Amino acid sequence: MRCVGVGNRDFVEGLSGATWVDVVLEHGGCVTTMAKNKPTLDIELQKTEATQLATLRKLCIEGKITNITTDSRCPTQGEAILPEEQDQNYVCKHTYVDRGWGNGCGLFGKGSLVTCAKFQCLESIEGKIVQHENLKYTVIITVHTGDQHQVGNETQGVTAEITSQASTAEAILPEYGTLGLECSPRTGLDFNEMILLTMKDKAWMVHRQWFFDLPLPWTSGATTKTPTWNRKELLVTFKNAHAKKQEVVVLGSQEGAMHTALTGATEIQTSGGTSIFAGHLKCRLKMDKLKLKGMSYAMCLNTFVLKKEVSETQHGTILIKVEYKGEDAPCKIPFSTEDGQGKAHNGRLITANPVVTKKEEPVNIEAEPPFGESNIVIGIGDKALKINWYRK
Ligand X SMILES: *[C@@H]1O[C@H](CO[C@H]2O[C@@H](C)[C@@H](O)[C@@H](O)[C@@H]2O)[C@@H](O)[C@H](O)[C@H]1NC(C)=O
Ligand Y SMILES: *[C@@H]1O[C@H](CO[C@H]2O[C@@H](C)[C@@H](O)[C@@H](O)[C@@H]2O)[C@@H](O[C@@H]2O[C@H](CO)[C@@H](O[C@@H]3O[C@H](CO[C@@H]4O[C@H](CO)[C@@H](O)[C@H](O)[C@@H]4O)[C@@H](O)[C@H](O[C@@H]4O[C@H](CO)[C@@H](O)[C@H](O)[C@@H]4O)[C@@H]3O)[C@H](O)[C@H]2NC(C)=O)[C@H](O)[C@H]1NC(C)=O
Ligand Z SMILES: *[C@@H]1O[C@H](CO[C@H]2O[C@@H](C)[C@@H](O)[C@@H](O)[C@@H]2O)[C@@H](O[C@@H]2O[C@H](CO)[C@@H](O[C@H]3O[C@H](CO)[C@@H](O)[C@H](O)[C@@H]3O)[C@H](O)[C@H]2NC(C)=O)[C@H](O)[C@H]1NC(C)=O
Kindly list the residues in this chain that would bind ligand Y in the complex (CB under 6 A): 102, 147-149, 151, 153, 155-156
Least distance between ligand Y and beta carbon 350 (Å):
18
Q: How far is CA 275 from the centre of its chain?
A: 5
Number of residues that bind ligand Z (CB under 6 A): 7
- 118 contact, one of ligand Y, ligand X, a second copy, none, CB 5-8 Å limit per kind: ligand X
CA distances from 45 to 27, 130, 198, 236 (A): 6, 20, 24, 47
Output 152 or 326, the one with its CB closest to ligand Y: 152
Output 156 or 230, the one with its CB closest to ligand Z: 156
Number of residues that bind ligand X (CB under 6 A): 2
Output 67 or 192, the one with its CB closest to ligand X: 67
Least distance between ligand Z and beta carbon 55 (Å):
40
Residues 63-92 binding ligand X (CB under 6 A) are: 67
Residues 97-136 binding ligand Z (CB under 6 A) are: 102
> DSSP E strands: which ranges in 255-350?
284-286, 298-299, 304-312, 318-324, 331-332, 335-338, 348-349
User: Which residue is nearest to ligand NAG, using beta carbons?
Assistant: 67
* Interface characters, 327-346, with ligand X (x: CB under 6 A): --------------------
Q: Which amino acid is at 210?
A: W
Which of 147, 170, 328, 339 lies at the binding interface for ligand Z (CB under 6 A)? 147
Distance of alpha carbon 139 from alpha carbon 14, whole angstroms: 20
Residue 149 as a binder of ligand Z (CB under 6 A): the answer is: yes
Least distance between ligand NAG and beta carbon 118 (Å):
5
Least distance between ligand X and beta carbon 225 (Å):
14
Distance of alpha carbon 272 from alpha carbon 200, whole angstroms: 9
Name the residue among 82, 81, 115 with its Cα closest to residue 97.
115
Distance of alpha carbon 146 from alpha carbon 133, whole angstroms: 38
- 28 contact, one of ligand X, a second copy, ligand NAG, none, CB 5-8 Å limit per kind: a second copy
Distance of alpha carbon 117 from alpha carbon 126, whole angstroms: 24
Q: How far is CA 308 from the centre of its chain?
A: 35
Q: What are phi and psi of 259, to 5 degrees?
A: -50, -60
Which of 118, 282, 286, 315 lies at the binding interface for ligand X (CB under 6 A)? 118
Which of 27, 73, 94, 118 lies at the binding interface for ligand NAG (CB under 6 A)? 118
Residue 155 as a binder of ligand Z (CB under 6 A): the answer is: yes
Name the residue among 252, 122, 136, 272 with its Cα closest to residue 203.
272
Distance of alpha carbon 108 from alpha carbon 102, whole angstroms: 10
Distance of alpha carbon 376 from alpha carbon 386, whole angstroms: 5
Burial class (CB in 10 A: 0-12, 13-18, 19+), 3: buried
234 three-class SS: helix
DSSP H or E stretch at residue 258? helix 255-261
Residue 27 as a binder of ligand NAG (CB under 6 A): the answer is: no
Least distance between ligand Z and beta carbon 247 (Å):
23
Output 150 or 254, the one with its CB closest to ligand Y: 150
Least distance between ligand Y and beta carbon 202 (Å):
32
Output 88 or 103, the one with its CB closest to ligand Z: 103
Q: Would you tell me which residues interact with ligand NAG (CB under 6 A)?
A: 67, 118
Q: Would you tell me which residues interact with ligand X (CB under 6 A)?
A: 67, 118
Q: Would you tell me which residues interact with ligand Z (CB under 6 A)?
A: 102, 147-149, 153, 155-156
